[PDB]
Design a protein around this motif. Structure first.
Motif, PDB file in Angstrom:
ATOM      1  N   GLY A  70      30.088  49.021  33.943  1.00 26.99           N
ATOM      2  CA  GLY A  70      31.210  48.430  33.231  1.00 26.99           C
ATOM      3  C   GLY A  70      31.572  49.136  31.943  1.00 26.99           C
ATOM      4  O   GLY A  70      31.955  48.504  30.962  1.00 26.99           O
ATOM      5  N   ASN A  77      41.312  41.367  34.910  1.00 27.12           N
ATOM      6  CA  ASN A  77      41.270  40.379  35.981  1.00 27.12           C
ATOM      7  C   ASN A  77      42.564  39.589  36.134  1.00 27.12           C
ATOM      8  O   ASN A  77      42.553  38.366  36.267  1.00 27.12           O
ATOM      9  CB  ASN A  77      40.097  39.427  35.777  1.00 27.12           C
ATOM     10  N   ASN A 136      30.858  46.090  45.072  1.00 26.51           N
ATOM     11  CA  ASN A 136      29.729  45.203  44.882  1.00 26.51           C
ATOM     12  C   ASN A 136      28.427  45.988  45.046  1.00 26.51           C
ATOM     13  O   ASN A 136      27.938  46.168  46.157  1.00 26.51           O
ATOM     14  CB  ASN A 136      29.780  44.058  45.900  1.00 26.51           C
ATOM     15  N   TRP A 167      30.207  41.973  42.399  1.00 25.39           N
ATOM     16  CA  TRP A 167      31.555  42.552  42.433  1.00 25.39           C
ATOM     17  C   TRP A 167      31.988  42.888  41.012  1.00 25.39           C
ATOM     18  O   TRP A 167      31.945  42.039  40.120  1.00 25.39           O
ATOM     19  CB  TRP A 167      32.570  41.589  43.060  1.00 25.39           C
ATOM     20  N   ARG A 168      32.413  44.130  40.803  1.00 26.87           N
ATOM     21  CA  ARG A 168      32.810  44.563  39.474  1.00 26.87           C
ATOM     22  C   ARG A 168      33.867  45.642  39.542  1.00 26.87           C
ATOM     23  O   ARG A 168      33.940  46.388  40.517  1.00 26.87           O
ATOM     24  CB  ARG A 168      31.608  45.148  38.727  1.00 26.87           C
ATOM     25  N   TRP A 169      34.686  45.723  38.500  1.00 27.60           N
ATOM     26  CA  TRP A 169      35.695  46.763  38.433  1.00 27.60           C
ATOM     27  C   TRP A 169      34.975  47.987  37.880  1.00 27.60           C
ATOM     28  O   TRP A 169      34.242  47.876  36.897  1.00 27.60           O
ATOM     29  CB  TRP A 169      36.825  46.363  37.485  1.00 27.60           C
ATOM     30  N   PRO A 206      34.768  44.945  33.671  1.00 30.06           N
ATOM     31  CA  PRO A 206      33.945  43.740  33.803  1.00 30.06           C
ATOM     32  C   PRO A 206      33.753  43.245  35.229  1.00 30.06           C
ATOM     33  O   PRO A 206      34.300  43.807  36.185  1.00 30.06           O
ATOM     34  CB  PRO A 206      34.695  42.729  32.944  1.00 30.06           C
ATOM     35  N   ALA A 207      32.969  42.183  35.363  1.00 28.14           N
ATOM     36  CA  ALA A 207      32.715  41.586  36.658  1.00 28.14           C
ATOM     37  C   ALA A 207      34.027  41.017  37.185  1.00 28.14           C
ATOM     38  O   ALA A 207      34.936  40.698  36.414  1.00 28.14           O
ATOM     39  CB  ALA A 207      31.678  40.481  36.528  1.00 28.14           C
ATOM     40  N   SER A 213      36.523  38.332  38.501  1.00 24.09           N
ATOM     41  CA  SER A 213      36.651  36.897  38.264  1.00 24.09           C
ATOM     42  C   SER A 213      37.705  36.307  39.202  1.00 24.09           C
ATOM     43  O   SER A 213      37.902  35.092  39.260  1.00 24.09           O
ATOM     44  CB  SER A 213      37.009  36.617  36.797  1.00 24.09           C
TER      45      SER A 213
END
Lengths: 115, 115
Positions: free
Chosen positions: A34, B43, B64, B68-70, B74-75, B77
């Motif tokens: 991240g 998000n 993932n 799951w994250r960009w 960040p994660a 949402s």
């Protein structure tokens, strides 16, 4: 606060690796965590930041793919020591910015905002 | 302005591929072009951006590995349709986000700064 293993400074968290990876792999590591490889989009603070480093180089978010540019940021307006024209990846150390073959395995620095 | 084959939108340039590649290869293609696989780090904006797409899926920087994250963000949402737990790569189309095996060859979207 910053996650474990990361370091705080101002409003961001930094990750200084111990392992060495080539530029592409260093990017993936930061991306998976991240974050982004270290950049100075304002084109300021390199010398000051370098005061916390030594002679060893760290990969940062700087490359020459379409001219020297900060990853996801503006063009480079600072001098980057470039010994050979074929070096397209940028690294940082105490004495400033220096170009290197992207294949060289160096420690790297990731950066992200403190949540 | 944006290079040829790329498309402008606001402050960035986007590349919509015609050919199909698996997720890792799509990520690599964008990286080598001084750009990155599309992400929505805040998000939000997925539905709106999807209004320019159709039924066919495009790989984006959503995965993932450790949740799951960009990539570089960040994660996740937002909801991502995942019919099978083993699908670790994310794609986008008109109707939203959907998980897929990372081996599937899909078109992809790159994003970079406009200059």
């Amino acid at each position: 606060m910053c996650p474990i293993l990361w370091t705080r400074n101002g409003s961001h968290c930094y990750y200084f690796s111990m392992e060495k990876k080539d530029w592409n792999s260093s990017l993936k590591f930061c991306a998976d965590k991240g974050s982004h490889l270290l950049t100075f989009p304002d084109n300021q603070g390199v010398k000051l930041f370098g005061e916390y480093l030594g002679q060893d180089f760290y990969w940062i978010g700087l490359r020459n793919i379409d001219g020297w540019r900060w990853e996801g940021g503006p063009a480079l307006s600072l001098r980057i020591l470039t010994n050979s024209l074929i070096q397209r990846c940028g690294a940082i150390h105490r004495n400033g910015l220096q170009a290197s073959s992207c294949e060289v395995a160096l420690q790297w620095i990731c950066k992200k905002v403190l949540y």
